[PDB]
Amino acid sequence: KESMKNRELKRQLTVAKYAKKRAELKAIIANPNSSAEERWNAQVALQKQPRDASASRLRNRCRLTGRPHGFYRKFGLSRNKLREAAMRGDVPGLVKAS
């Protein structure tokens, strides 16, 4: 859809917006020398943030097409747009071989 790319655009904003406090709240919990009173109130600040901030909510879709399945991260393309753009000599250094 087009309305479905648009709702997973703003997830990428809200993850990259906060992005620093959640490093600190997970720095407090991960220490064995940390006190649980400093841990328990640190648990409060995680769950009162909106949940669309973790990377697990983020879903790497194809950038030109939007199809979820068949994505590679050494490119930005889908499974079936990568073929049509490679036969036209665009992708540099890419050939067939055996």
Binding site: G76, M87, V91, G93, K96
Partner: protein, 205 residues
């Protein structure tokens, strides 16, 4: 069925349309630039026919060589389009952009330039064959040694998907030594979608 005649010869015949090295952390951040440049430029240069848009990346900026067979339409009154786009190619591609324009002398021997004219004729309600018997002999008075043109689609009919096929000369396709052009430009008539394929065969070796 008939694997694409560029993808088997990248190497012994032709080369890429874009050369630049990139690390594994920026490789997918230069592709998304260079793929929405070509969708941008062809939508602007719908006239003043364009065959090839090459992109080099020298040290840290850019270089682009747009090829037209009619450069005077694009360079009009000393770059009123050249500097106007060069302001606005940077807005999609944050590096400073060079724009260079060559000529495509003998415009009837490159497949993109030919197949754009076929969509023009077949949307003026010209006959499907009188347009194409004349678009091959004109491209055989000068130049090539073989031409195939396939015209498939609705072809005016009711429920008809026929394929016109006309050939002249010699066209090999299982010889990697040869030199073949290829282009698929489409056409939107008042009913149906017609796709056109072109296989201009220049000289071999």
């Amino acid at each position: 069925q008939k694997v694409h005649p560029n993808g088997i010869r990248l190497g012994i015949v032709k080369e890429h349309t874009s050369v630049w090295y990139a690390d594994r952390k920026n490789y997918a951040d230069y592709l998304f630039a260079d793929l929405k440049v070509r969708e941008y430029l062809q939508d602007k240069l719908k006239s003043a026919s364009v065959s090839r848009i090459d992109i080099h990346r020298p040290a840290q900026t850019a270089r682009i060589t747009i090829h037209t067979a009619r450069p005077g339409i694009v360079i009009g009154k000393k770059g009123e389009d050249v500097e106007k786009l060069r302001q606005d190619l940077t807005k999609q591609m944050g590096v400073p952009v060079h724009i260079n324009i060559e000529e495509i002398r003998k415009p009837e021997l490159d497949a993109m330039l030919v197949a754009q004219s076929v969509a023009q004729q077949l949307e003026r309600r010209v006959m499907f064959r009188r347009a194409m018997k004349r678009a091959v002999q004109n491209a055989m008075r000068i130049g090539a040694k073989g031409i195939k043109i396939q015209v498939s689609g609705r072809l005016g009919g009711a429920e008809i998907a026929r394929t016109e096929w006309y050939r002249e000369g010699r066209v090999p396709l299982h010889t990697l030594r040869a030199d073949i052009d290829y282009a698929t430009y489409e056409a939107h008539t008042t009913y149906g979608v017609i796709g056109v394929k072109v296989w201009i065969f220049k000289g071999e070796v």
